[model samples]
Target: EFNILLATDSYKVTHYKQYPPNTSKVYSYFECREVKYEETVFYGLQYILNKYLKGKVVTKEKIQEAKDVYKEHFQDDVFNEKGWNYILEKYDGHLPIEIKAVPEGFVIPRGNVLFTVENTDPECYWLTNWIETILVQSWYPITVATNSREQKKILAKYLLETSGNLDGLEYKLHDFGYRGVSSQETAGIGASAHLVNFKGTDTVAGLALIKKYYGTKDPVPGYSVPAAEHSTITAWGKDHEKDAFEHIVTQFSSVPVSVVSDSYDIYNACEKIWGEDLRHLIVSRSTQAPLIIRPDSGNPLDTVLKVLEILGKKFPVTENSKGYKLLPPYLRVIQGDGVDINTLQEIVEGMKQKMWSIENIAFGSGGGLLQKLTRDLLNCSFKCSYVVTNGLGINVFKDPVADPNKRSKKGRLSLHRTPAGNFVTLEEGKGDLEEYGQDLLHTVFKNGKVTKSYSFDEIRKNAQLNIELEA
Candidate 1:
């Protein structure tokens, strides 16, 4: 936190500035530049960075401590030795890195620039060298948000086709990946991303992240219903399964509740225990709160259909505008195993084909949604696109001979979300594509100072605005 700000980047990257361009007043600039993910870019780069930098400071001693560590590793005496090493010296023993980016939730197609950065001072042009780590690390939340956006689109389509309205769309997908994630960071990143489109979450770590990083409070962004797991249910033994079901109804009758129903047998649990044994209790309860049943194993679609069919007959059901069977408002099924973005699409499509309303079932995703993805899932990369040596900007692009798609953008770039809603990348010095494209890019961070501010509402709004139009 302290020292790395002044000497950011891996040992190799810090020395990259020492390459031939080291001699000039280099106007070397780079950008993460593209979503690279074809599905959707639920953009959150600026918001992520601003939140990460809030109230964080690095003292000269901290910078020196970092310098000592780098020297030990690189066999050098000072930090950022090959580069202009005074990120701390020039900024009063502070790390000064400037970042310019598109708004937190601006959406655009792949191959368009997302944001750009360069050292704000000519004398310390390499100050931003290590900063790329943090700038591009933002891809994680954007990836999570983008992935969830696609899942929402899939659910949205079925919601529209079947119900003709998006009433429960926000609660359709619940995050069950809290413990499934590798770390607290993953939990926060994954949960926050999922909340971009859905409100259901079992991941409290993400809520903390939103509150801590995004300044969120009252009217919390995520929620979950009281739910039981295998331990609580199975702990009662198979003989008392009926009693277990009765206990949940008796305890949570006043509020919505979820119960894991597959500890012993999913089919019988749905058919006999929940369907017959507790049918009278649930259907006749004085409270209107619904009981959510969770099935953790078996083919998601097949298992859900079985549960829904049983529940449909046990509880009252009706047909929606599209002639699909809608679950009773007080009852539903949740599938949380082996579910991912593709699995979600399959389930939604399957339900639509079977004449079942999207309302009959909700989804919970674990590893696939939160941990299985890599930055490369979106082809994320950071690269220098342009360099100025003689006070002239030169277009420096990497056109890989093996894979043309691997080539990078060239020249000083500005990204614009066109009036028509498409993204257009422009070379700044070309005298083309003026301010009319709504200039999606703005200066968010400069000189170790964050110049732009963002809120959770702002990010979610910008993200939803695009989703409403495109999705």
Candidate 2:
């Protein structure tokens, strides 16, 4: 038997804080003095303690006070008689495996493993299996957040290069991952990840979590006037072609307008209704702003060229104040349905031959941005390497893999950048190691209590900083 001093500053005290005060007192009594053990499931013990201390004030003093009560009430034979050896065999003398991960919302490359944990002791192999579930669950948020950030970045780059607008990036990036992921809780976590990189979210719960944990905020509004912000809008279907024209004229008469013409018959609609009613609007609105025409269905490239040709003749140009003849900006088509990044790229290439103004082309993407690009892109996992043994007298650890790819580098890892060019790198191993560079992994939690708190907005801003460095 080993005699261990029960102290208020011990690691056991930290574990005590993980539960409520009353439950902590009860458990401290059992743990401080040797007690009967019956191969208890870890989760079961956690549940029991949680249930018992439903409304108890768990404090440090209560945990310390309970230690004396436990030693007085201690029964060595009770534990031995209950087959304590079986429970001890499972958890004694194990080293706690510490983990370090790339914070959520930072972009990670395809090949990088986002985080790792290893056995503290050099020899204990089987303990690795015991902690697998907890480790794997912990990394999901970081992975989801990182991937969502990358997808947003890709879209942001595309919009900036093509449309020349940076304002959309500032809008709320609603996390609609709930409809896409396999599990409900996973969906919630995935939504939390998305908020880490981009600005907006429709997921209210995810927003609260970010606010409570990461300190993020809602995006600012009223950046641009509606008409100038979106020059042209598209409408599809045969039934709504006329409605589209009416809606644009009613809502944004001062702005250039575009309407879809090919619901039932593209050629007939253009020759009959478009060449007459729409052409009149273009000429009438010419003093205020040019009117635009759109054809959302069919071959967008072919339809746009065809519509422009018909409108050029129907809406004859008159001499302007500058002596140059001008017709209404007639029939500038926007392809809305079924456009992807590749499709948009192809349209841009096609515009060169058609001599079409790049301003005339605008895209409305919904499911593609909300669903297709954001889900399970990054793989994340955690593992345990140590356990307590011999009644807390010693800590033992295990190594599962001999290779670097499979093996975890022990201790905390830091994220570092060089001063010259600010090249980023990871430095692993114990505290303040000169060889490892700057430590990026910080003690967010210590002794079962949070050392520092961060808000989702702060996390997003931090992620933005990381993006700036990468860019």
Candidate 3:
């Protein structure tokens, strides 16, 4: 569970109308700065709006539960019985939030608004006011998706250079990070982000999230193989290594399978134990399917290149139009250990320089893919943009003299896409609101249900049509 209850934040907010006097509507904005980010995957917006808030806002039972948690766990008087009783007396926890956002999969440029929010009703302006803590949870998964996309871009660069097109780009980066992340929910959220660009994943729990929250009927999103770990390989002992390899090949022979090859001497294992001993068996039993060759230890690029050379001699390869040699489809290599985006770039380029096609190898990541990034990687923040009190609209922003880089956006905001495919925001009372070029942000959730919905495929299409994808 993602504990969406914990995600329903705002407990620290002042009790009842204790905020600034007569504060009715607060227009808050969120954006990412390009200091360290070139693009952002504006994702998981639907998760917060439709899946999380839709029910919590309408159902009295859910609202009472929210009040109980805030009162008991958060120990905030504002969410206690009396406070919620007052709010329920008028608003009943029904959020009148007007969420205007770029399409879910939009690969928004840095410094452009991903979304802006305000309460449609004056009394409930503060309803959407204090939920920043819960709302910012989208940052992790969305950043992970962008990081995953950037990795694909890096891989695509070398793939196009060497193989001539991004044929195997979808599965080029695999999800090995679920086991390495901080929590199970982290596994689900982060790995799901990776699946946005690729069809390969080892995290079944993560892939399940699409169906759980994203309205997926059948989330057949990932591809995996019958593979063995070090324990299975070592448990057979170095002497019985031949039997271990045989067992995996014979038992799971019907499907594609991977056998970890470095229990003892990697050279001896691949060369004599499998290459020589079971050479005919692997070649004939290959089923014309990709047999995953996993190298767990030693230098990744060196080991994979050496294995490719050995396999080229032992198996068969064919030359593409580019004169680069590709390993037969039945034999592919995976360098999963010690790999991040940078390492992947090196390995792909190194293999190309070594006269091998990028199609021969794939990369997997653990901590590097999931736990490696900080929230500040994109300079993400949420701030109040404007205020409306007693029918007076005020545009508000902060520009601290200490750090000018922390300056925030001013006035009511709306996003418009230019003819050349770019987003420009227009502020209320500052320029045409709806007429300032068609607003990209539209209402997705309101009035107790999702007014509009986005399918997984629709969002994926937007994310794929990214800004500056090196096209």
Candidate 4:
């Protein structure tokens, strides 16, 4: 069993006795403390809520298991046995907490409150911070989502420059990070965060997670075309390379498909087999769907330009209004290796210099999307800001003298939108005391019940970017 009681840091199990005498409540807020991006996309908390925090979480068996381990580990009864028993009996195993936040997918400036947590039952004052270990993992999804949105800014710029509009934008970037991530849970959550902006994905767990957690009315939130791997092509042997290519086109005819063309020789595969031997076959299916030639090896920049020039000679090319060459409707390319926001931008810029349209190719990122990032990228932190003890409401904060960056926010916080339509966070409950504005943080969870839910479409809509960069 996944014991909620053992899901926290061992020190947190002993914290119930550490608070000052008669401490009744603890309130804390989660934020991206770094100005990595002007704004961070708030996401994946709903997934956390559905998977870990919702309903009947605490149990007698879980508490007893934690108790037994803690007694042996500590050589003392440091575990909060009375507290866990109280929760199991009085609340029937529901956690005594409330969580509030801006709607999922809201893009707010970094250093603002993404969400807040507080203990509802006074006796469970220590409970709010107990689960910080799990709650802090939200950094992974938020960072992936933010990284994806940042890439879209670059893609949109190039697409607008070459194609004149955002046609076929949703399918431009595909999620290919499943194998490179740490685990299935990491792939599912990180890939779903990417899907918030794009509809292309190869990660099956991402789709399953969104359906189960986000409750999308749309059955399939992301799509993937039939694609080939090196093993499948190599299994046919080098002697039957053209036959392997022929088999792929024949099987998935009149539908989009991807085949890795770099097993033996990428140039030979593109110029001889695909461009020459299979040219007629591809042109025949051009109007119905595209055959995406995936070049999985070599220097991405030089290789892409070379392949484009070769295919340009073998296939017909049309000039767009931007005076950039476009490939035949049936043939395009995808760069799945050595791709990330930086390398992708470099490739696009190289294409622009060569008069090739950005529409000629798409991209897939593996380790770059899910494995190359870290929680510190955004300086994510969940910090205590307010506590009530001895019948007094007290503000709490941390400020290291050597580093102002380590300073934390003071007192209860509220997020508000200014008249200029930008988000600003008010600290120390000033938004409430002075009535500066209405707090945008709505109560989404209370006493183990979900008060609000957001659909998949709503998240996509909230994350929509204008042709003009976000103000």
Candidate 5:
């Protein structure tokens, strides 16, 4: 006997809206017929839609609105049949199933088999086979987000120490990977992962999705404050020293100003132009914030030290009333270009070694955090362990590969966090082996219904908590 089941939500239906006009006629033929049960055919569409889209706004209301818009295009009776009546013909009208997945936001390793969806009822096994694509697609975003978050944490630690403050580092972390991804959905999800890591993203649409689905709070809540942090743009032999110093100060008057003084001549620009005019502004406008000088062209460590040397020479006397020689920490330096994790570390360590005041040095990293970490390096993948089938009663699970590294532990497995904060994995029949640890699986869905609701922010926070670096 052959059994045929329909997938509740395929990409074609949910994403493309390519469902047949006479879905009722086609569903009735499959549902009312007296077919054999030797093989069961299921629609991949429904499995995907039911798994991923059931609670989404599109499926909840927009699907009906779409039906109305394209009313002449759809069969009237398509929505009439409640439950699986849209497809089922002879046997019991239930799709009994068990879905096992690593809890969303859980930190999963590279080779980890994250999920398995199997039909608990013998007759529904055939229907499970069609869910692989959707399963993989849905989980990949979470996994990528987790990994990217870890990377950002590392970068954040570096930035905080190097910059002497974490105030502006948030904006320094930007996601530049949207254009490189395979699809827009991938870009959206991938960028969401980047944001989870505290990396600001250029993809505005991706951020909106994160805010919608994940409820991520705005990192920058208020209006856009234009803070100019300048870098020296090298021109011809004549260095625009006075212009560069005065230009930023004059335009963004009284604001937290930053200037770059390494265009034509680094020492001369700082000693002559910056020391005279820029120093006067800092002294005269004592109430207003001081200027931040940035060096991009030369070695950051060397350039900063030289700039500091110039500042100390110019501002030798601290008190204006009495000539008391005290070095005021008025000016700061921000290094751009070639400034990375290691370079920042070296600069910090170098400053400490020389006993130099590094309250001024900050960093701006571009392509390093964004484009450098390729997808292959990130270990992004999706896999499905089981599909629905219609057959005899047996708790059937397949070991997909011979290599233990590639093997999927069959049957009902439970992942438990031990009292000591370690994970423990237990098979249905065996005793808990603390060495093997617990499997990180949970029942996210039951009998075609979503059993859990995760606010996007909750998921992002949980994801951050679940991630732990291996010993």
Candidate 6:
């Protein structure tokens, strides 16, 4: 799975034979042609660059292995042995490609270039496209970051309106996707993407990955509170449910904690055990830390409204100047189940209709945050826009008559910001930094070396959301 030669689609194995006779260069760019989020956060390209492509990627042994594997898979050996050997002998196994990308974590509009890939060595022109399988994996992080950013904007809007301040907004959306992903790598990548917008995460691997790959020293990139899962709560038995809540509340009283209260009856746990019985314990904590009640089952909107209504009655609730209800600082709810973007909005809007402030609730998303998305969520496409053949730079593109959305850009491209502060992709080489402000696309990687690196903090800054509502 780590082999760069075998990292591409099997059909890409024979792409060398399909290019024009004298094709020496292939220029391709990655873009989100259309997406649910009109703006996208460009991220995770540095991870892909450093983890997969940097330093000594090609090797004789791996090339030999790929030859055998492709022969067995295709019933004929179509592996580009000559190109592999050329790269091995010439570059000492380092890839010969230059990857330019929009700065990671920058929010660029859709239908614009995110990154561009072109072969540095004309001999390795096919190598550019061959790496698509791995480079395209960037969609995962880009999508996660964009989705999380959009969610943040939505949350921030109501937070501003209802609470009048964005306090503790970073911890509002916790990453609950570690178990929901297919692999540890997926969890790490997706969760790290989420951390670009938020500070809270339950995925330990996400934190580890940022330290390992993003040039961090001792500081953890994401943080989590002491939270109870269903097993910990259920182990105390249904007969002593209050004991479980009491023990957890007593154990982590001074620190903010989350308790999965829906193990038996969410309403009963919230109304009776949490509100009536254990409310004093949570409130008695010196730090006034929150006890986040987790409601994991039932209708997300209905349950959250009922729980908020009940908790609002039991706890001291406040009303914002905007006329929305706010729960006490020490008691709130986290709806972890059925929390995709749609249902998240459903609950948020539902609460708004009920005059509850967004501050009263946080979210924990597992499959919804990380897994419930596809590559086409953004309609991401990587297509060859320009090719050099026979010492001539030829602009190339695919314009599907049937589907205009499938049309690819043409020529040597540059991403630009117009004078009006809008991003535009200038194809056919018209983008001049002097003319179009600044070329947002910059050289990030060149010949197996990262030309630029982004700290987790830098990414967080780039991804910061500032929403202003109409007066």
Which portions of model 3 show Cα errors greater than 4 Å?
1-11, 15-18, 57-83, 90-92, 215-219, 428-435, 465-471
Q: For all the candidates, what are their Cα RMSDs to the real structure?
A: 3.0, 14.2, 3.1, 1.7, 12.2, 2.1
Per-residue error (Å), model 6, residue 97:
0.8
Q: What is the full ranking by TM-score, best candidate first?
A: 4, 6, 1, 3, 5, 2
Q: State which candidate, 2 or 6, has the greater TM-score.
A: 6
TM-score of 2: 0.48
Better of 4 and 5 by lDDT: 4
**TM-score of predicted structure 5:** 0.55
Cα RMSD, model 3: 3.1
Report how far residue 428 has shifted in candidate 2, in Å: 7.3
Candidate 4: C-alpha RMSD after superposition: 1.7
Steric clash pairs (candidate 4): none
Each prediction's total of clashing residue pairs, residues at least 3 apart in sequence or on different chains, is 4, 29, 0, 0, 36, 0
Over 4 Å off, model 5:
1-191, 197-206, 217-241, 257-273, 282-292, 297-331, 339-362, 384-413, 425-471
Point out where model 1 deviates above 4 Å: 5-9, 13-17, 21-39, 51-56, 75-78, 81-85, 216-218, 286-288, 417-421, 431-438, 465-471
Error of 3 at 117 (Å): 1.8
lDDT of 3 by residue, 1-471 (tens): 333334544544453456577878878878885414588898887776755666434345645676676677656545534433444455555456667677787888788778777767666666555566766777888888998888888887777777787776898888888789999978888888888888789988876677766644354767877888889978877679889888887787768778888777776777786678887667765644556788888888888888888888877778988889987777778888999877887888889888898878888898888888777888778878898888888888889899888888889777877767776666544446444566777777664457666776776777783333546
Candidate 1 TM-score over all chains jointly: 0.90
Report how far off residue 301 is in candidate 4 (Å): 1.4
What is the TM-score of each predicted model, taking all chains together? Answer: 0.90, 0.48, 0.89, 0.97, 0.55, 0.96
Please, what are the lDDT tens digits per residue for candidate 6 over residues 84-112?
A: 99989999988889988888879888899
Q: Candidate 2: deviation at residue 425, Å?
A: 6.8
Instruction: Report the lDDT of model 3 for residue 292.
Output: 76
Query: How far is 128's C-alpha from truth in model 5 (Å)?
Result: 6.3
The residue-level lDDT of candidate 1 at 175 comes to 88
Q: Which 10 consecutive residues of model 1 have the lowest summed lDDT?
A: 23-32
Q: Which candidate number maximizes TM-score?
A: 4
